[PDB]
Design an enzyme around this catalytic site. Structure first.
Site: not given
Ligand code: CLF
Ligand code: ICS
Ligand code: CLF
Ligand code: FE
Ligand code: FE
Lengths: 478, 522, 522
Positions: B152, B156
């Site tokens: 994501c 973005v």
């Molecule tokens: S590095 Fe850490 S775990 Fe990764 S997104 Fe970013 S804060 Fe979260 Fe989240 S919903 Fe799925 S798991 Fe990611 S692609 Fe986004």
């Protein structure tokens, strides 16, 4: 065995990397040399991971929500952003607690904003305010709210500090914004730093003007113990048997009340230096509370730490400490007498996170085993300086080891046991090498204190001496 | 204290009197917790219908969801292909979480790489990240293919996967002929099954779009099987077994069964058998393509119909008697192979077990949740068994799927009390099972907490959990089970009837109180 | 009173207040029941060491045995032959009981006939009963072979099966060429497995003894497989699958798999696929004969070694890892077929599951009971898994089998706390599980009562039952499970680990009391 052999192994495994990857990975592999406390011994750490190498590190959100803020019971931690990060981290860590889940305890639960496309395009601040309203509606007995940012929150420019301040003023609730976006930093360590800063900025000074709490010359606060499998409780029983009064506990079986009560404590006992050193230093600077490290892994380290802690108080505390050590001596003596012959002379390799690669060496060597290799995912050069004394001479040290590097190191060293996380567990179980989870304790535990040492000895014997390892090869093959 | 002869882990070590006293002192001294009367009152409030109305009035807060993000399914689909490395363009924490999730469900190694994008990549865009990551991945792990999904964070900032891969190829970071299919998998759209769909469409478009000129439908006399997001190895195995029994030549695209079930023989295999590139290239020559899970393969369906010109049948998931029969009939129609006597005997044996267990299955009430196709198939099978699926929850459902399930329930007299919920999480289901108590609830491991909550209300209010779905974390080797075909129907029926029988046995184990019904024969 | 909307069966109907009051009034007025304090004292006494010594001093009374009589096993053996009718010469109540037993275990039709010998036949013999019954059975049910067993009544009075059948054939009641094998199965000797042995020896001697002149060992390039008393259909299925995958010509004699798993398709087939008379006649021509259960196939082994001149290998039951390896290696040595890669992969997957679940399995204490070969294989697999089989019970065992199991236990460090009991019933086991409490007990459905007893002593003394063995009456479709081979080892491993995890989840479900260990991941 030989330093030159280990160096040749490092240079051999580094061959497949491209020039830039090989150059970067060279600085992260080293051979231990005691009496060296610096970044000179070809060990650089806390750097950007090389892309496309299948690392093990997490993100800042993992370091903040999943480590520091999550284990706080009477607080609701909202994973601000898309479903995902919040779901994969739900009940992943075994930070034990006591409470009625859903009513006054929420560690197991998963609160999220579940960002959709419209929340990315138009922002998510009004959604956050509405979410706080609904949290107040449906969870009356929560004693605070913390929002944990994910990557889109920091990318799309969402002001969560203003919303947190406004809603906290409106509801008279402690609403803590944490800017733990995953792309921030290189690993979980920046998440630890950000969570500590949020604790300092929004929680710690809440009772600075208050003087209702009654102090006592024996007031200590455990910080850095996240109660993995009951570790914090096992350490707290030992501390309280010595006559001390554990006012605060960060953060496993912890509440916001004792985090606010921490500034009234005489001595701060740090277990995890890597994650709580920032708050320890801040509390020493502001409130003048001294902090000291301790190790409750194995009876030797446990006794040493208990004597060192009792040294900071009067003679009665030290006498009680000697009484506790004498009382608990027969139990760990029996445990070591039972389990040492089954484990004596076995080689162990470890790859854990911030400080467990060095804190558990005492327990292993107290059972008769030698740690022939260790490394960290996100530790700084301070941790390597501390562990260089603990590691034996001519032993391998690895920082942010990739899958190929650790696979080749295990292939060549051929240890009898590997202590690491879940992502390499089954890789090494396929190889036919006994494996133990050093993050979750393989859902066993606790491993702290004398009871923890008994459980640890039983687990090590169980995994290392299991008959299944002897049946990996089909009888009709040679 | 500890006894060396009988060592106690956390349970029941922390039930000792010293630990109990220490915990009570801690609670009464520094936790400042509410009195147990207040806690009990609030808990009783949470089990009522006023709290249910407040809960269902939620619009911004999600509590205990049941779904994941797209790149998880994208990674699973990428794993379904031969010597293929999943490569998630974005942040490394996402890949770590994906690997941990799949490791916990499957208890097997899961391979996935990231390009580890950071603040500077967030400012400038991760192009150098992609170049260095592709070079490092192909050098270190030597895959035949690299399948690229997105985090994501990269979605973005609007990273261009096509241009990034093309520039990596132009600057000699990877060879031009090296297959690098890609897919945009935004985590804020859909769920993991959507990511599986997007990744499969990307791979198929990579291997077929530019070679569409020389392809003739039905040339290789095969049927394309697209399973979708599947976490039961037995489902792949049963589909392959039934199609080989029928004498039908098939091509199972995205087959991760071998890589997720590698043997332990002292050797670690990063790559096991999967869908080869030859099958992916020869796929448009098949007679037809069958989508096992059509409710999250919409983009794949559109691509296969438009580009391959395959008349994809309107088939439901082959779960249970009627839908397995329909699937087999459609396969026989497409391939021209008659249905053999072995499959007829298997269906007869499933009907035999149905008639044997109908007495205990009839009238039972179930609250179930999971993925759309799986939930629909489970509801259909429960209707075939004379059970009442009172609460049906699908977090990642849509309006059309809800319409389909409502039409399925209407056509049966056992769906009269049923109610489908989409966009609802497991806190909603907790409220539902408190206010309209079902006999059992079927779902993944996350339902266990709900069970705990019910047991806290009282022993007569407890709703036991039956673990069928994804992910299952607190039980071992349940991922080897089957849910498709007559084999999967047999396994599901056995699980349901035996769970009912264990509950009855436990409720009647009290001597001189309820043991008059502790029958030896049931 | 009954609510029409919610109808209550006996449970929980008899927990109503009116029923409770009526039952209390009846007990207090007309039952002369001992005071509850006396009953509690007597029960607490029954769960003690002094009671255990008194119970183990028994020499004439048997309470809750774990075994049946020989004709049951004879009927099971006869059911494994093609178009064969089991015919028990004796009294009809025995056949009614046999059919009820097998119907309740398999949930399948079980066909067996009796000549209904009565007081008159008891006094004058049952030769007229034999003639009339053979003629009636052949005329009505039209079998290709009638296999004759005996009831204890006919065994006591010394009815001559051979003379009676010969007179039936010589007087024209049945064709002279019609096959009527017979076996003497005294119920006061051995147990049901002994009856299986006797029936198979009788059939083999009927079809082979006279025609031994033209037989050459190894002529048909096959291996005979004698499965013994088996009640899991998956065992036959897995043996056939493993032999076929290996490319080995095999002849499984007495195969009841088809007749005990008939499909329900609106038609009743009294006979399904079994061992043909041609297979039984050609059996001496095989390379060798392998006995799956050598501890109750002694008479068969003696006959095969003495008549067919086959050198029967000294193999254990192919249960677990090591013994399945030995079975496959011996089959390869005998037949010359190399062990394929599929079986190697299956063994590797079994080893992988063992490795994954060892932490939960290690150190667990099990009481267990069943038939000799099954018990032996279960103990071997438990020692392979790292468990402790503390209480090993075999009612129908002997000194030689006890010595073999003791040698097996002494070869492993996990057999230090294990005791083998022969000639002991389930009251003895109830005393043992009260005194030396194990974690679980593995046995048939009759153990459920034992579990109930333990729950009466307290929730902390309850010993859960794992239903593996024969007969299983309170669960549905468990007879389809596999016990032999790698597949059976995986099934048993999954059952054991998930039973342990279910118990742990039940023990930690109390909120604010023990739910700190209610872990999502295990
Ligand atoms: S590095 Fe850490 S775990 Fe990764 S997104 Fe970013 S804060 Fe979260 Fe989240 S919903 Fe799925 S798991 Fe990611 S692609 Fe986004
Ligand atoms: S917090 Fe840290 S990786 Fe100090 S992020 Fe990590 S429960 Fe490790 S070595 Mo998992 S710095 Fe704790 C840790 Fe150590 S999650 Fe646990 S085991 S003592
Ligand atoms: S008609 Fe009735 S049930 Fe039959 S024997 Fe006679 S009293 Fe008994 Fe008994 S041990 Fe077995 S079941 Fe028989 S062959 Fe004898
Ligand atoms: Fe595994
Ligand atoms: Fe049946």
């Amino acid at each position: 065995m030989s330093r030159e052999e280990v160096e040749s192994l490092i240079q051999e495994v580094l061959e497949v990397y491209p020039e830039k990857a090989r150059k970067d990975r060279n600085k992260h592999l080293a051979v231990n040399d005691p009496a060296v406390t610096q970044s000179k011994k070809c060990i650089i750490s806390n750097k950007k991971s090389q892309p496309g190498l299948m690392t093990i590190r997490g993100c800042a959100y993992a370091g903040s929500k999943g480590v520091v803020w999550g284990p706080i019971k009477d607080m609701i931690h909202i994973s601000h952003g898309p479903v995902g990060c919040g779901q994969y981290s739900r009940a992943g860590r075994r930070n034990y607690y006591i409470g009625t889940t859903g009513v006054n305890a929420f560690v197991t639960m998963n609160f999220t904003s579940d960002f959709q496309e419209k929340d990315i395009v138009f922002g998510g601040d009004k959604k956050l305010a509405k979410l706080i309203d609904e949290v107040e509606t449906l969870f009356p007995l929560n004693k605070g709210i913390s929002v944990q940012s994910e990557c889109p929150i920091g990318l799309i420019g969402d002001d969560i500090e203003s919303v947190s301040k406004v809603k906290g003023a409106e509801l008279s609730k402690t609403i803590v914004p944490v800017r733990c976006e995953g792309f921030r930093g290189v690993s979980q360590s920046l998440g630890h730093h950000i969570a500590n800063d949020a604790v300092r900025d929004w929680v710690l000074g809440k009772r600075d003007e208050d003087t209702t709490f009654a102090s006592t010359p024996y007031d200590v606060a455990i910080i850095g113990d996240y109660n993995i499998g009951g570790d914090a409780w096992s350490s707290r029983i030992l501390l309280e048997e010595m006559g001390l009064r554990c006012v605060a506990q960060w953060s496993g079986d912890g509440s916001i009340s004792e985090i606010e009560l921490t500034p009234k404590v005489k001595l701060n006992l740090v277990h995890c230096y890597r994650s709580m050193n920032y708050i320890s230093r801040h509390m020493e600077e502001k409130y003048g509370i001294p902090w000291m490290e301790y190790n409750f892994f194995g009876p030797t380290k446990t006794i040493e730490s208990l004597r060192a802690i009792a040294a900071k108080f009067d003679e009665s505390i030290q006498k009680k400490c000697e009484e506790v050590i004498a009382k608990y001596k027969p139990e760990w003596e029996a445990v070591v007498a039972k389990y040492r012959p089954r484990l004596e002379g076995k080689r162990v390799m470890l790859y854990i996170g911030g400080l467990r690669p060095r804190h558990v060496i005492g327990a292993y060597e107290d059972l008769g085993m030698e740690v022939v290799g260790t490394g960290y995912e996100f530790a700084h050069n301070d941790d390597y300086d501390r562990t260089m004394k603990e590691m034996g001479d001519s032993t391998l040290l690895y920082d942010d080891v990739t899958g190929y590097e650790f696979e080749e190191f295990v292939k060549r060293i051929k240890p009898d046991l590997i202590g690491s996380g879940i992502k390499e567990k089954f890789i090494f179980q396929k190889m036919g090498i006994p494996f133990r989870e050093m993050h979750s304790w393989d859902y066993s535990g606790p491993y702290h204190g004398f009871d923890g040492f008994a459980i640890f000895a039983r687990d090590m014997d169980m995994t290392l001496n299991n008959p299944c390892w002897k049946k990996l090869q089909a009888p009709w093959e040679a | 204290s500890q006894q060396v002869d009988k060592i106690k882990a956390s349970y029941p070590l922390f039930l000792d009197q010293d630990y109990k006293d220490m915990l009570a002192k801690k609670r009464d001294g520094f936790e400042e917790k509410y009195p147990q009367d207040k806690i009990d009152e609030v808990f009783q409030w949470t089990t009522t219908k006023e709290y249910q109305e407040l809960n269902f009035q939620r619009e911004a807060l999600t509590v205990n969801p049941a779904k994941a993000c797209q790149p998880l399914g994208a990674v699973l689909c990428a794993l379904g292909f031969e010597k293929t490395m999943p490569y998630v363009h974005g942040s490394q924490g996402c890949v770590a979480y994906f690997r941990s999730y799949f490791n916990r469900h499957f208890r097997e190694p899961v391979s996935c790489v990231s390009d580890s994008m950071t603040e500077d990549a967030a400012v400038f865009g991760g192009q150098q990240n992609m170049k260095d990551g592709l070079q490092n991945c192909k050098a270190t792990y030597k895959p035949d293919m690299i399948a690229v999904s997105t985090t994501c964070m990269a979605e973005v900032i609007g990273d261009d996967l096509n241009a990034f891969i093309n520039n990596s190829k132009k600057e000699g970071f990877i060879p031009d002929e090296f297959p690098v299919p890609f897919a945009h998998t935004p985590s804020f759209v859909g769920s993991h099954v959507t990511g599986w769909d997007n990744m499969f469409e990307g791979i198929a478009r990579y291997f077929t779009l530019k070679s569409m000129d020389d392809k003739v439908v039905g040339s290789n006399k095969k049927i394309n099987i697209v399973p979708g997001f599947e976490t039961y190895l037995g489902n792949f195995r049963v589909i392959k077994r039934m199609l080989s029994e029928m004498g039908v030549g098939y091509s199972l695209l995205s087959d991760p069964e071998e890589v997720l079930d590698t043997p332990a023989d002292g050797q670690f295999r990063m790559y096991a058998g999967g869908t080869t590139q030859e099958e992916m290239k020869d796929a448009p020559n098949a007679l037809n393509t069958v989508l096992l899970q059509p409710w999250h393969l919409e983009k794949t369906k559109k691509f296969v119909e438009g580009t391959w010109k395959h008349e994809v049948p309107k088939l439901n998931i082959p779960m249970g008697l009627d839908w397995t029969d329909e699937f087999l009939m459609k396969v026989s129609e497409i391939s021209g192979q008659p249905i053999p006597a072995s499959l007829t005997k298997e269906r007869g044996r499933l009907v035999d077990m149905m008639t044997d267990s109908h007495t205990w299955l009839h009238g039972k009430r179930f609250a179930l949740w999971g993925d759309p196709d799986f939930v629909m198939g489970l509801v259909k099978f429960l209707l075939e068994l004379g059970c009442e699926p009172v609460h049906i929850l699908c977090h990642n459902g849509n309006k059309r799927w809800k319409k389909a399930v409502d039409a399925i329930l209407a056509a049966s007299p056992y769906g009269k009390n049923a109610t489908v919920y989409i966009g609802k999480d497991l806190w909603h289901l907790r409220s539902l099972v408190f206010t309209d108590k079902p006999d059992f609830m079927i779902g993944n491991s996350y339902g266990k907490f709900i069970q705990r909550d019910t047991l806290h209300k009282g022993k007569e209010f407890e709703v036991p959990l039956i673990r069928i779905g994804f992910p299952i974390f607190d039980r071992h080797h349940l991922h080897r089970s089957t849910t498709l075909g007559y084999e999967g129907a047999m396994q599901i029926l056995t699980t349901l009837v035996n769970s009912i029988l264990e509950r009855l046995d436990e409720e009647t184990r009290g001597m001189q109180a309820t043991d008059y019904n502790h029958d030896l024969v049931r």
